[PDB]
Amino acid sequence: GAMNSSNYAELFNNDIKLFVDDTNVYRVTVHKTFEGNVATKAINGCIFTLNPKTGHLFLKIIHTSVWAGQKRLSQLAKWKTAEEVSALVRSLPKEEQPKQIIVTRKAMLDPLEVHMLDFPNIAIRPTELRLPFSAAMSIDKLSDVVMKATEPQMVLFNIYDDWLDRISSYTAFSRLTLLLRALKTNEESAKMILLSDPTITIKSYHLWPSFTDEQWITIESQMRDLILTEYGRKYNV
Amino acid sequence: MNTVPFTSAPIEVTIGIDQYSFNVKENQPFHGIKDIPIGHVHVIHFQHADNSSMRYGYWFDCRMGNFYIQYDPKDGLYKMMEERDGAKFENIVHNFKERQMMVSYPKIDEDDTWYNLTEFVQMDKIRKIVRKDENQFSYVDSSMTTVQENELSDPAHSLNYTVINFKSREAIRPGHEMEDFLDKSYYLNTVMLQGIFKNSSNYFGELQFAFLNAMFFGNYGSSLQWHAMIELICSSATVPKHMLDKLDEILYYQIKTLPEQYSDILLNERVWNICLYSSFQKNSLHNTEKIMENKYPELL
Numbered sequence: 390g391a392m393n394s395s396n397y398a399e400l401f402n403n404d405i406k407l408f409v410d411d412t413n414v415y416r417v418t419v420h421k422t423f424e425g426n427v428a429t430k431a432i433n434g435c436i437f438t439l440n441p442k443t444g445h446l447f448l449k450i451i452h453t454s455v456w457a458g459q460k461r462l463s464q465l466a467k468w469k470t471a472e473e474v475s476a477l478v479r480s481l482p483k484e485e486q487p488k489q490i491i492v493t494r495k496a497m498l499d500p501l502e503v504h505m506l507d508f509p510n511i512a513i514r515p516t517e518l519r520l521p522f523s524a525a526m527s528i529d530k531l532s533d534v535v536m537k538a539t540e541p542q543m544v545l546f547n548i549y550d551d552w553l554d555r556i557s558s559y560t561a562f563s564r565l566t567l568l569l570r571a572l573k574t575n576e577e578s579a580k581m582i583l584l585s586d587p588t589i590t591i592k593s594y595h596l597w598p599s600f601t602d603e604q605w606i607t608i609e610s611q612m613r614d615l616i617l618t619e620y621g622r623k624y625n626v
Numbered sequence: 627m628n629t630v631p632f633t634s635a636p637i638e639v640t641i642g643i644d645q646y647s648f649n650v651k652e653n654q655p656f657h658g659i660k661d662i663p664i665g666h667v668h669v670i671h672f673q674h675a676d677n678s679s680m681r682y683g684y685w686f687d688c689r690m691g692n693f694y695i696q697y698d699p700k701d702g703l704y705k706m707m708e709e710r711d712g713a714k715f716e717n718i719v720h721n722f723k724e725r726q727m728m729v730s731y732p733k734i735d736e737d738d739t740w741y742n743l744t745e746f747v748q749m750d751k752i753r754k755i756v757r758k759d760e761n762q763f764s765y766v767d768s769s770m771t772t773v774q775e776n777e778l779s780d781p782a783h784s785l786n787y788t789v790i791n792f793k794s795r796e797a798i799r800p801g802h803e804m805e806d807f808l809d810k811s812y813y814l815n816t817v818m819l820q821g822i823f824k825n826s827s828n829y830f831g832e833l834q835f836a837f838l839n840a841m842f843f844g845n846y847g848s849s850l851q852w853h854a855m856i857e858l859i860c861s862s863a864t865v866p867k868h869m870l871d872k873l874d875e876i877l878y879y880q881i882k883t884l885p886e887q888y889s890d891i892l893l894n895e896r897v898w899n900i901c902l903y904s905s906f907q908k909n910s911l912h913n914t915e916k917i918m919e920n921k922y923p924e925l926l
């Protein structure tokens with residue numbers, strides 16, 4: 390059934406499961422035409438498919454050529470997502486295929502279920518959690534590879550860098566969702582926090598800075614402050 | 627005009643014959659139903675006065691044999707039986723008629739309701755849905771489950787309706803996932819009509835039989851089947867024009883006949899609002915939409 394605060398530790402058991410988020414698949418800019426009407430122009434997108442136990446991220450880049458000649462792009466985007474996730478599963482060795490796929494938006498359930506009819510033992514699940522994966526494009530290196538793509542492409546990342554050498558996957562996921570929640574509520578401030586100290590760098594093979602354990606505690610504290618604040622700035626409290 | 631005699635009526639019971647019904651008191655001198663129109667299937671059905679639970683009954687066609695009813699005690703239920711001695715049967719019926727111990731099938735001359743509800747229903751197809759090959763008539767009751775219900779448990783007592791499942795490999799062509807799920811024309815026309823039913827008449831016959839079992843016995847799996855068969859047509863962009871016109875007539879007479887007080891349980895709000903207002907065929911069911919909007923506007 391649906392994934393929620395009650396069954397939260399199930400994300401970190403050794404059974405393979407993937408989150409699928411489709412919020413950045415179909416992206417546009419909305420603009421005025423010379424005639425003064427409104428036109429939208431599609432830009433590159435991505436499917437965000439994440440194994441929360443290991444941090445392995447399967448970033449399928451969605452080139453603008455996919456929408457070339459199509460109608461009802463918002464609906465197509467969901468089926469394109471399900472098509473690509475299904476193709477990913479079929480490409481994995483049997484022992485690497487997920488036993489569950491959790492979709493972050495309920496509208497992905499039927500498209501994914503239909504595309505996965507061949508895999509009746511893979512459970513397709515919704516979630517009640519409000520996960521902040523839409524902010525994946527605020528991660529500079531992820532945004533960069535999506536915008537530079539000239540064709541459809543899959544790029545593999547570990548969204549936890551080397552954190553699992555020192556912390557558990559429960560704690561790593563908690564850090565990740567905090568970072569992304571902050572980036573989503575006030576991207577400029579969040580990014581200021583993460584880079585303010587120029588002596589802490591991002592390794593070429595990493596997505597986030599090389600904080601020590603103590604610096605991560607400070608960083609994490611500063612992100613909580615941001616989120617509560619904005620929650621004040623927003624609601625006035 | 628044919629006759630279904632009753633040996634006796636030892637228990638108080640409401641007896642239905644097609645869309646009609648009458649009450650019989652415990653040990654009332656009731657000996658059956660005469661003047662039954664030839665050319666149609668019929669259903670004779672029962673609700674005991676003491677246990678309104680388990681409506682049950684028998685689908686039959688008097689062209690296929692001489693049938694009678696007798697309350698056998700073993701099982702506790704009015705049972706249909708065939709009399710093979712045709713002279714014994716004619717003699718029984720004539721005596722009961724002379725003594726005027728039979729109710730007359732009370733058809734109004736102008737009235738085509740039963741025809742309109744059973745237009746495509748054939749006994750030979752009923753007997754493949756309800757498997758009991760040693761009888762010419764078929765037993766149905768409120769509790770019997772469908773083959774598909776059994777997949778989600780006694781196979782002999784099942785309703786073998788054609789399984790329809792919109793999220794199944796039968797319904798969805800590899801490579802056409804989005805197309806086939808959003809437009810079910812392939813599944814309707816190639817899988818179901820060309821492949822399984824062979825023609826639209828057999829499709830409509832099963833649809834009409836499912837509705838009647840839902841209405842007369844409160845059979846929940848039959849109601850599921852009726853709605854699934856409607857939804858498969860309405861969710862197809864490509865349907866033969868004659869099928870849509872006939873469907874509108876079929877559904878009109880079904881909705882017209884449904885008891886006003888059973889609409890809450892026998893009509894699925896989601897299917898009907900989708901079919902009449904969202905689907906490809908939202909504009910193709912004028913008679914059905916008009917009677918639904920005037921008889922059950924709350925459901926919509």
Ligand SMILES: NC(=O)C1CCNCC1
Nearest residue numbers: 402403404405406442443
């Ligand atoms: N959930 C997983 O991905 C497990 C982690 C441990 N290695 C096998 C795969």
Ligand SMILES: NC(=O)C1CCNCC1
Nearest residue numbers: 417428429430431456457
């Ligand atoms: N296909 C495109 O890139 C645009 C997006 C939707 N509006 C016009 C066509």
